[PDB]
Scaffold this motif. Structure first.
Motif, mmCIF file in Angstrom:
data_model
loop_
_atom_site.group_PDB
_atom_site.id
_atom_site.type_symbol
_atom_site.label_atom_id
_atom_site.label_comp_id
_atom_site.label_asym_id
_atom_site.label_seq_id
_atom_site.Cartn_x
_atom_site.Cartn_y
_atom_site.Cartn_z
ATOM 1 N N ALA A 43 0.832 -1.192 0.000
ATOM 2 C CA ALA A 43 0.000 0.000 0.000
ATOM 3 C C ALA A 43 0.869 1.246 0.000
ATOM 4 O O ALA A 43 0.818 2.076 -0.921
ATOM 5 N N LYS A 44 1.697 1.371 1.035
ATOM 6 C CA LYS A 44 2.599 2.504 1.144
ATOM 7 C C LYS A 44 3.531 2.565 -0.050
ATOM 8 O O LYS A 44 3.803 3.645 -0.587
ATOM 9 N N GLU A 45 4.022 1.411 -0.482
ATOM 10 C CA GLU A 45 4.964 1.396 -1.585
ATOM 11 C C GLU A 45 4.284 1.796 -2.882
ATOM 12 O O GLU A 45 4.912 2.422 -3.740
ATOM 13 N N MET A 46 3.009 1.447 -3.040
ATOM 14 C CA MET A 46 2.244 1.959 -4.169
ATOM 15 C C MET A 46 2.177 3.473 -4.125
ATOM 16 O O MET A 46 2.325 4.146 -5.152
ATOM 17 N N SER A 47 1.902 4.030 -2.947
ATOM 18 C CA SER A 47 1.838 5.480 -2.843
ATOM 19 C C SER A 47 3.178 6.113 -3.194
ATOM 20 O O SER A 47 3.233 7.171 -3.833
ATOM 21 N N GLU A 48 4.272 5.458 -2.814
ATOM 22 C CA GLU A 48 5.591 5.966 -3.165
ATOM 23 C C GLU A 48 5.840 5.859 -4.659
ATOM 24 O O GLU A 48 6.529 6.701 -5.243
ATOM 25 N N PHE A 49 5.277 4.832 -5.286
ATOM 26 C CA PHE A 49 5.385 4.664 -6.729
ATOM 27 C C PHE A 49 4.684 5.800 -7.456
ATOM 28 O O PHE A 49 5.261 6.453 -8.338
ATOM 29 N N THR A 50 3.413 6.008 -7.113
ATOM 30 C CA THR A 50 2.642 7.162 -7.553
ATOM 31 C C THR A 50 3.460 8.438 -7.446
ATOM 32 O O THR A 50 3.685 9.147 -8.437
ATOM 33 N N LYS A 51 3.948 8.705 -6.237
ATOM 34 C CA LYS A 51 4.670 9.936 -5.958
ATOM 35 C C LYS A 51 5.877 10.088 -6.871
ATOM 36 O O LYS A 51 6.052 11.118 -7.528
ATOM 37 N N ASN A 52 6.718 9.064 -6.929
ATOM 38 C CA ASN A 52 7.947 9.172 -7.700
ATOM 39 C C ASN A 52 7.649 9.389 -9.177
ATOM 40 O O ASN A 52 8.346 10.158 -9.855
ATOM 41 N N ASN A 53 6.590 8.759 -9.682
ATOM 42 C CA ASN A 53 6.214 8.976 -11.073
ATOM 43 C C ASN A 53 5.843 10.422 -11.310
ATOM 44 O O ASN A 53 6.354 11.070 -12.226
ATOM 45 N N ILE A 54 4.927 10.939 -10.498
ATOM 46 C CA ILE A 54 4.433 12.282 -10.758
ATOM 47 C C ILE A 54 5.555 13.292 -10.596
ATOM 48 O O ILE A 54 5.598 14.306 -11.299
ATOM 49 N N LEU A 55 6.505 13.014 -9.707
ATOM 50 C CA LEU A 55 7.680 13.864 -9.621
ATOM 51 C C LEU A 55 8.503 13.782 -10.894
ATOM 52 O O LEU A 55 9.110 14.774 -11.314
ATOM 53 N N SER A 56 8.534 12.613 -11.528
ATOM 54 C CA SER A 56 9.260 12.509 -12.782
ATOM 55 C C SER A 56 8.562 13.312 -13.869
ATOM 56 O O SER A 56 9.198 14.094 -14.582
ATOM 57 N N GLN A 57 7.247 13.146 -13.988
ATOM 58 C CA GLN A 57 6.483 13.862 -15.005
ATOM 59 C C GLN A 57 6.621 15.364 -14.825
ATOM 60 O O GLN A 57 6.883 16.106 -15.782
ATOM 61 N N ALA A 58 6.454 15.823 -13.589
ATOM 62 C CA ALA A 58 6.629 17.231 -13.278
ATOM 63 C C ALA A 58 8.021 17.694 -13.653
ATOM 64 O O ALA A 58 8.192 18.748 -14.272
ATOM 65 N N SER A 59 9.028 16.909 -13.279
ATOM 66 C CA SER A 59 10.406 17.254 -13.592
ATOM 67 C C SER A 59 10.592 17.441 -15.087
ATOM 68 O O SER A 59 11.241 18.394 -15.533
ATOM 69 N N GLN A 60 10.006 16.550 -15.877
ATOM 70 C CA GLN A 60 10.128 16.661 -17.319
ATOM 71 C C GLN A 60 9.459 17.916 -17.828
ATOM 72 O O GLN A 60 9.986 18.591 -18.717
ATOM 73 N N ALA A 61 8.288 18.232 -17.287
ATOM 74 C CA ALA A 61 7.639 19.480 -17.646
ATOM 75 C C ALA A 61 8.542 20.663 -17.324
ATOM 76 O O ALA A 61 8.625 21.626 -18.097
ATOM 77 N N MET A 62 9.269 20.578 -16.211
ATOM 78 C CA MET A 62 10.197 21.641 -15.866
ATOM 79 C C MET A 62 11.354 21.700 -16.837
ATOM 80 O O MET A 62 11.929 22.771 -17.037
ATOM 81 N N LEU A 63 11.726 20.567 -17.427
ATOM 82 C CA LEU A 63 12.737 20.607 -18.475
ATOM 83 C C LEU A 63 12.189 21.289 -19.714
ATOM 84 O O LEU A 63 12.868 22.115 -20.343
#
Lengths: 50, 50
Positions: free
Chosen positions: B15-35
């Motif tokens: 459960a928690k690890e799924m939430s961390e998966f979610t989080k890390n992905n959206i941080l990646s997507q956001a990061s790319q948008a920042m690029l």
């Protein structure tokens, strides 16, 4: 971080350098206009001779 | 009981690890948008040159 320092030595700030480009050009154009004015005095010397 | 301890070391709480998966992905997507935003400054530099 080293990339940043590298760039600060190597990478020119092309904004400022563009402004310097602008400046140096217009100084050249102006200078040429001053030549075109400079070289017209002798012909009124001729008017004194003629 | 040993199975429980084993699992607490070994078994991830997905459960928690799924939430961390979610989080890390959206941080990646956001990061790319920042690029995608980062790499658009130089073209207005060109607009100063052009």
């Amino acid at each position: 971080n080293l990339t940043a320092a590298e760039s600060r030595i190597r990478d020119v700030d092309m904004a400022k350098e563009m402004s310097e480009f602008t400046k140096n050009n217009i100084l050249s154009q102006a200078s040429q206009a001053m030549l075109a004015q400079a070289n017209q005095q002798p012909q009124n010397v001729l008017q004194l001779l003629r």
